[PDB]
Design an enzyme around this catalytic site. Sequence first.
Site, mmCIF file in Angstrom:
data_model
loop_
_atom_site.group_PDB
_atom_site.id
_atom_site.type_symbol
_atom_site.label_atom_id
_atom_site.label_comp_id
_atom_site.label_asym_id
_atom_site.label_seq_id
_atom_site.Cartn_x
_atom_site.Cartn_y
_atom_site.Cartn_z
ATOM 1 N N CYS A 163 0.803 -1.218 0.000
ATOM 2 C CA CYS A 163 0.000 0.000 0.000
ATOM 3 C C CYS A 163 0.840 1.274 0.000
ATOM 4 O O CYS A 163 0.310 2.362 -0.193
ATOM 5 C CB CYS A 163 -0.934 -0.015 1.217
ATOM 6 S SG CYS A 163 -1.584 -1.682 1.609
ATOM 7 N N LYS A 328 -10.095 7.435 0.183
ATOM 8 C CA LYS A 328 -10.392 6.067 -0.254
ATOM 9 C C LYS A 328 -11.880 5.741 -0.129
ATOM 10 O O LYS A 328 -12.348 4.734 -0.666
ATOM 11 C CB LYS A 328 -9.576 5.038 0.537
ATOM 12 C CG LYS A 328 -8.106 4.925 0.128
ATOM 13 C CD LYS A 328 -7.451 3.717 0.788
ATOM 14 C CE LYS A 328 -5.973 3.611 0.448
ATOM 15 N NZ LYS A 328 -5.198 4.764 0.965
ATOM 16 N N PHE A 390 0.449 3.165 4.533
ATOM 17 C CA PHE A 390 0.912 2.060 5.378
ATOM 18 C C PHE A 390 0.492 0.721 4.785
ATOM 19 O O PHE A 390 -0.681 0.355 4.834
ATOM 20 C CB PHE A 390 0.332 2.189 6.791
ATOM 21 C CG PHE A 390 0.450 3.570 7.373
ATOM 22 C CD1 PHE A 390 1.654 4.264 7.319
ATOM 23 C CD2 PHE A 390 -0.642 4.172 7.986
ATOM 24 C CE1 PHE A 390 1.766 5.542 7.867
ATOM 25 C CE2 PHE A 390 -0.540 5.448 8.538
ATOM 26 C CZ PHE A 390 0.667 6.134 8.479
HETATM 27 N N LIG Z 1 -3.054 8.804 1.920
#
Ligand SMILES: [N+]
Lengths: 406, 406
Positions: A163, A328, A390
């Site tokens: 990610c 997101k 992360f």
């Molecule tokens: N981000």
Amino acid sequence: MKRAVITGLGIVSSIGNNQQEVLASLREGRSGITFSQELKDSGMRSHVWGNVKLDTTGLIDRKVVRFMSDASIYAFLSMEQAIADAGLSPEAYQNNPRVGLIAGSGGGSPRFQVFGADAMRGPRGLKAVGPYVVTKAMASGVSACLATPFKIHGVNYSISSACATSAHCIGNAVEQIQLGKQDIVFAGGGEELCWEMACEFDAMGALSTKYNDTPEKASRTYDAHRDGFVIAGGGGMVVVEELEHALARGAHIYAEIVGYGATSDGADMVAPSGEGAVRCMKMAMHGVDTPIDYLNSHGTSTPVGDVKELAAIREVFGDKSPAISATKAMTGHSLGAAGVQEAIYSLLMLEHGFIAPSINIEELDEQAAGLNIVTETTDRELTTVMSNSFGFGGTNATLVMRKLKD
Amino acid sequence: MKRAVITGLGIVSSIGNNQQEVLASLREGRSGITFSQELKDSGMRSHVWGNVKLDTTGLIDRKVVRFMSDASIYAFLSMEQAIADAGLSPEAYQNNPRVGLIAGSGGGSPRFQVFGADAMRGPRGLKAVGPYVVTKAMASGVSACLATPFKIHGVNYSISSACATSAHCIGNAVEQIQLGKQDIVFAGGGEELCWEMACEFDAMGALSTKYNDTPEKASRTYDAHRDGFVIAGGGGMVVVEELEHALARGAHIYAEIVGYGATSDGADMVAPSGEGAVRCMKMAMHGVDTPIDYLNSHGTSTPVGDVKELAAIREVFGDKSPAISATKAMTGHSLGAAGVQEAIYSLLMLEHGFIAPSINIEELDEQAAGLNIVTETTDRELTTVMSNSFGFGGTNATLVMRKLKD
Ligand SMILES: [N+]
Ligand SMILES: [N+]
């Protein structure tokens, strides 16, 4: 010694095929998540995704696209956008040892990997596989397929970190400038979207499955009813350039990368430790004399992940909690492309003076109380923004971008 | 102006499971290539490979190896060796923000990518996939599966660049030291060996196919009758450390990395341009005023590749052409692991004062005439060595290592 600034950007995402379309979706809090017949037919529990609404047919030369997987296609298109948006022409960036490319994907290409194996196990064997699978399936696909066509002579490789992939790519591009090794480095990433890869995350129980009825509501970061992230695909690319070099050509500067953090949890293989995120964010803020106005969180819309990062943010700022929103909730998790795409969303917010809304929060999470989580498009003059990435394996990346002083 | 040195090494290769075993093979010109029934049964034309002669079962804690593919296993084992060889105690490198890890693979894990797809299409679906496929198949698996177990708190990501992969990892580690960001960085990589990935190369015509009856003779770099490389698997890891830090703790120093080149061809997708290799070697020699006593070539035993690199070497050194040998003639091409493993072969040669032979040259190619290609083990006091790694996609890496005074 040298300073690094962003002089161009390009993006192909679920909420837009360029910075203008993406800018529109952001201010409107528009979702890019739709129902996937492909995901459902494969047997998956998650039936929603953030697909790229674009017909790439004929957008790339036959002799060039023949070696590419979707991750490379998306990144390539994003790099074309970035080049033009940067005001650069072949004579300035091609066949130039001072110009490089650092871009990667999180999973390379499970689709062509499986395609090769399936074809090989067929009666045609090697003939069915074809001689183009290697460049599509290898982990360095995204860098290899772009560096060759664009005549890149400087650095050329892919950094992978789940990610955080495209985030470290950008950070490493900065290091190249600080080291005086490169004047320009195109940094970004790309990620395909397919059941072949998505079923791995589903079998891991990390994907949302209780909202296949209402796709646009599946990704609900910070919502007490969140149940996993929505997988997405796409690409992004930014032009990282040495300051004096940019000023010399009259480049348009979006912002300066004043901070870059990269740490490791060394704890859990799938879940965050928080301790790592804290050090990462602090590393990125070290030396920055200005406060963070906006923080584009990692927040993938997961039970533990969401809360963990918030706890880390509290530890770092305490009573100086900046505006926060998880884009997101609109775009989904593009994995390897998330880093650069989210960095771009931040640059667009910094450039257009506004904050994207953290959508689908029907019931804020108790552990998110006491923070400034923006749930509505708010206009404001941002100066210094922060973006966190992360990924699995406890790999952390944080970028701090700030407007240049005239 | 921080200096970086190598204080530890670890390796799992077709020619040895530790530096002692490998030392012996190098001195004896021992081949690590064997016949592979697996490759033959898959329908491939190439039936030979450089396999790891070791059952890794039970060598890694159940809860750790559960997330690992073979690339990570080989790299993990290599890292345990490097840690012990460097004399680092757990409290000296664990939970330390100044200690990082940079390691990747060329192809992640095609086997587990295919496994997940095969299982998903079966009668069990998701249940057959399991929750460990992501960490095994993702491109960053090698860094993710090692950073966590070894409690790494510093940098943590994977660099991917095909055949140059682990070479760039080492170079990037050096950069972390020069930037003052880390005191120690474990650098290297791993690569699984399987028909799933191998057939891709065979379907590209890159693998040897005319010597399946005599496996040990298939890899023959510079031989007039070479016909492709011999794919291999394995791992390698070196401890890159800042000079002062190593000296203070009384570490054993193999050599200083005095040069690191990284360039891009920006020409052909699968063939070398040579022009890129020239720049890469020159970049690694910048400031290096000592002569190159030995050069460990990329030389994979391919018709075009082998001579392209020799031409580049001629342009760089002219009439000052150093001794040369292509260890791949013995070991096969480990792809992602080739960079670090060959850096290790080079360090063993420098440490023990000998030049390993470039075997299987029954008829020296005419374009190699005039060069000093060593075909028999030769004892000699080496001081400065160079190791080239050029991967597909036109990505080049060169490392120059030198013995320290007294
Ligand atoms: N981000
Ligand atoms: N090499």
